[PDB]
Protein backbone atom coordinates (compact mmCIF):
# COMPACT_ATOMS: atom_id res chain seq x y z
CA UNK A 1 0.00 0.00 0.00
CA UNK A 2 2.91 2.31 0.83
CA UNK A 3 4.98 3.46 -2.17
CA UNK A 4 8.64 4.47 -2.20
CA UNK A 5 10.88 4.02 0.80
CA UNK A 6 7.83 4.82 2.96
CA UNK A 7 7.28 1.06 2.79
CA UNK A 8 10.70 -0.27 3.87
CA UNK A 9 11.34 2.88 5.93
CA UNK A 10 10.07 0.96 8.95
CA UNK A 11 12.23 -2.07 8.14
CA UNK A 12 15.24 0.15 7.52
CA UNK A 13 15.09 1.55 11.06
CA UNK A 14 14.70 -1.92 12.55
CA UNK A 15 17.58 -3.23 10.44
CA UNK A 16 19.96 -0.70 11.97
CA UNK A 17 19.07 -1.78 15.52
CA UNK A 18 19.28 -5.45 14.59
CA UNK A 19 22.75 -4.97 13.11
CA UNK A 20 23.73 -2.65 15.97
CA UNK A 21 23.82 -5.64 18.32
CA UNK A 22 26.30 -7.40 16.04
CA UNK A 23 28.47 -4.26 15.85
CA UNK A 24 28.95 -4.28 19.63
CA UNK A 25 29.63 -8.04 19.73
CA UNK A 26 32.51 -7.79 17.26
CA UNK A 27 33.77 -4.74 19.15
CA UNK A 28 33.51 -6.49 22.51
CA UNK A 29 35.50 -9.46 21.21
CA UNK A 30 38.17 -7.14 19.82
CA UNK A 31 38.73 -5.72 23.31
CA UNK A 32 38.52 -9.24 24.73
CA UNK A 33 35.90 -8.25 27.33
CA UNK A 34 33.38 -10.58 28.97
CA UNK A 35 30.38 -10.06 26.70
CA UNK A 36 28.05 -11.98 29.03
CA UNK A 37 28.94 -9.27 31.54
CA UNK A 38 26.02 -7.29 30.12
CA UNK A 39 23.47 -9.41 32.05
CA UNK A 40 25.90 -11.80 33.74
CA UNK A 41 23.34 -13.25 36.16
CA UNK A 42 20.27 -12.24 38.18
CA UNK A 43 21.26 -11.45 41.76
CA UNK A 44 20.39 -7.99 43.07
CA UNK A 45 22.77 -5.31 41.79
CA UNK A 46 24.42 -6.28 38.50
CA UNK A 47 28.22 -6.26 38.38
CA UNK A 48 29.41 -4.95 34.99
CA UNK A 49 31.51 -2.47 36.97
CA UNK A 50 33.43 -1.95 33.73
CA UNK A 51 32.43 1.32 32.08
CA UNK A 52 32.65 -0.43 28.71
CA UNK A 53 29.61 -2.60 29.49
CA UNK A 54 27.61 0.28 30.95
CA UNK A 55 28.79 2.72 28.27
CA UNK A 56 28.19 0.23 25.48
CA UNK A 57 24.72 -0.42 26.87
CA UNK A 58 23.80 3.21 26.19
CA UNK A 59 24.78 2.79 22.53
CA UNK A 60 22.21 -0.02 22.26
CA UNK A 61 19.74 2.20 24.15
CA UNK A 62 20.06 5.59 22.41
CA UNK A 63 19.52 3.85 19.08
CA UNK A 64 16.49 2.01 20.49
CA UNK A 65 15.06 5.25 21.90
CA UNK A 66 14.76 6.40 18.31
CA UNK A 67 12.39 3.52 17.60
CA UNK A 68 10.04 4.42 20.46
CA UNK A 69 10.07 8.15 19.73
CA UNK A 70 9.78 7.33 16.04
CA UNK A 71 6.52 5.47 16.64
CA UNK A 72 4.94 8.58 18.12
CA UNK A 73 6.26 10.71 15.23
CA UNK A 74 5.85 8.18 12.41
CA UNK A 75 2.19 8.17 13.49
CA UNK A 76 1.75 10.96 10.92
CA UNK A 77 -1.71 10.04 9.63
CA UNK A 78 -1.26 7.73 6.64
CA UNK A 79 2.28 8.05 5.29
CA UNK A 80 3.58 5.44 7.75
CA UNK A 81 0.29 4.17 9.22
CA UNK A 82 -0.93 3.26 5.70
CA UNK A 83 -3.55 0.58 6.39
CA UNK A 84 -5.43 0.31 9.69
CA UNK A 85 -3.11 -2.60 10.55
CA UNK A 86 0.01 -0.50 9.95
CA UNK A 87 -0.72 1.42 13.16
CA UNK A 88 -0.16 -1.65 15.36
CA UNK A 89 2.40 -3.11 12.95
CA UNK A 90 4.90 -0.53 14.17
CA UNK A 91 4.41 -1.53 17.81
CA UNK A 92 4.41 -5.19 16.84
CA UNK A 93 8.09 -5.02 15.95
CA UNK A 94 8.92 -3.20 19.18
CA UNK A 95 7.51 -6.15 21.07
CA UNK A 96 9.88 -8.48 19.23
CA UNK A 97 12.82 -6.08 19.59
CA UNK A 98 12.38 -6.66 23.32
CA UNK A 99 14.54 -9.77 22.77
CA UNK A 100 17.73 -8.39 21.09
CA UNK A 101 17.86 -5.61 23.71
CA UNK A 102 17.41 -8.14 26.50
CA UNK A 103 20.52 -9.89 25.22
CA UNK A 104 22.73 -6.79 25.06
CA UNK A 105 21.16 -5.56 28.31
CA UNK A 106 18.29 -3.18 29.02
CA UNK A 107 15.68 -3.99 31.68
CA UNK A 108 12.88 -6.40 30.75
CA UNK A 109 9.28 -5.25 31.15
CA UNK A 110 7.30 -6.67 28.25
CA UNK A 111 4.57 -7.36 30.79
CA UNK A 112 3.75 -3.66 31.13
CA UNK A 113 3.63 -3.08 27.39
CA UNK A 114 1.74 -6.32 26.76
CA UNK A 115 -0.65 -5.61 29.63
CA UNK A 116 -1.37 -2.25 27.99
CA UNK A 117 -3.28 -4.25 25.38
CA UNK A 118 -5.66 -5.48 28.10
CA UNK A 119 -6.90 -2.04 29.16
CA UNK A 120 -5.86 0.08 26.17
CA UNK A 121 -6.53 -1.22 22.59
CA UNK A 122 -3.01 -1.95 21.31
CA UNK A 123 -1.66 0.97 19.27
CA UNK A 124 -4.39 2.78 17.33
CA UNK A 125 -3.99 6.34 16.04
CA UNK A 126 -4.74 7.89 19.45
CA UNK A 127 -3.92 4.61 21.22
CA UNK A 128 -0.23 5.10 20.44
CA UNK A 129 -0.29 8.57 21.98
CA UNK A 130 -1.99 7.20 25.11
CA UNK A 131 -0.10 3.89 25.44
CA UNK A 132 3.08 5.87 24.71
CA UNK A 133 2.86 7.01 28.34
CA UNK A 134 3.93 3.55 29.49
CA UNK A 135 6.79 3.39 27.01
CA UNK A 136 8.32 6.69 28.18
CA UNK A 137 8.64 5.04 31.58
CA UNK A 138 11.15 2.56 30.17
CA UNK A 139 13.13 5.38 28.52
CA UNK A 140 13.62 7.07 31.89
CA UNK A 141 14.21 3.90 33.92
CA UNK A 142 16.73 2.51 31.42
CA UNK A 143 18.51 5.82 30.84
CA UNK A 144 18.52 7.04 34.45
CA UNK A 145 19.90 3.68 35.58
CA UNK A 146 22.80 3.71 33.10
CA UNK A 147 23.11 7.48 33.12
CA UNK A 148 24.23 7.74 36.72
CA UNK A 149 27.03 5.23 36.38
CA UNK A 150 27.88 7.13 33.19
CA UNK A 151 28.95 10.46 34.70
CA UNK A 152 29.85 8.63 37.91
CA UNK A 153 33.26 7.68 36.53
CA UNK A 154 33.87 11.31 35.61
CA UNK A 155 33.57 12.42 39.25
CA UNK A 156 32.35 10.97 42.64
CA UNK A 157 30.33 14.17 43.13
CA UNK A 158 27.60 12.58 41.03
CA UNK A 159 24.54 11.71 43.13
CA UNK A 160 20.85 11.00 42.53
CA UNK A 161 18.04 9.24 44.40
CA UNK A 162 16.78 7.79 41.12
CA UNK A 163 19.98 5.76 40.68
CA UNK A 164 21.25 3.59 43.54
CA UNK A 165 24.95 3.13 44.26
CA UNK A 166 25.73 -0.57 43.83
Q: Whose CA is closest to 1, among 83, 71, 76, 74?
A: 83
Report CA-CA distances (Å) from 84 to 66, 79, 125, 128: 23, 12, 9, 13
Instruction: Give me the torsion for CA of 115, 116, 121, 124, rounded to 10°.
Output: -140
Three-state secondary structure readout of the chain: CCCHHHCCHHHHHHHHHHHHHHHHHHHHHHCCCCHHHHCCCCCCCCCCCCHHHHHHHHHHHHHHHHHHHHHHHHCCCCCCCCCCCHHHHHHHHHHHHHHHHHHHCCCCCHHHHHHHHHHCCCCCHHHHHHHHHHHHHHHHHHHHHHHHHHHHCCCCCCCCCCCCCC
CATH of 1-166, one of 3.40.30.10, 1.20.1420.40, 1.10.10.10, 1.10.3720.10: 1.20.1420.40
Q: Which residues contact 21 (CB under 8 A, 6 or more apart)?
A: 60, 100, 103, 104
Contact 69, 129 (CB under 8 A): no
CA distance 95 to 131: 13
Count CB-CB contacts under 10 A for residue 93.
16
Nearest C-alpha neighbor of 82 from the set 51, 125, 117, 116: 125
The experimental method behind these coordinates is NMR
Amino acid sequence: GLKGETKIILERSAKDITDEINKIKKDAADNNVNFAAFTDSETGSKVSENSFILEAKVRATTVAEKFVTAIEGEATKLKKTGSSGEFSAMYNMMLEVSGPLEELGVLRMTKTVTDAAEQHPTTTAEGILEIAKIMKTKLQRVHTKNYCALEKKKNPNFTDEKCKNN
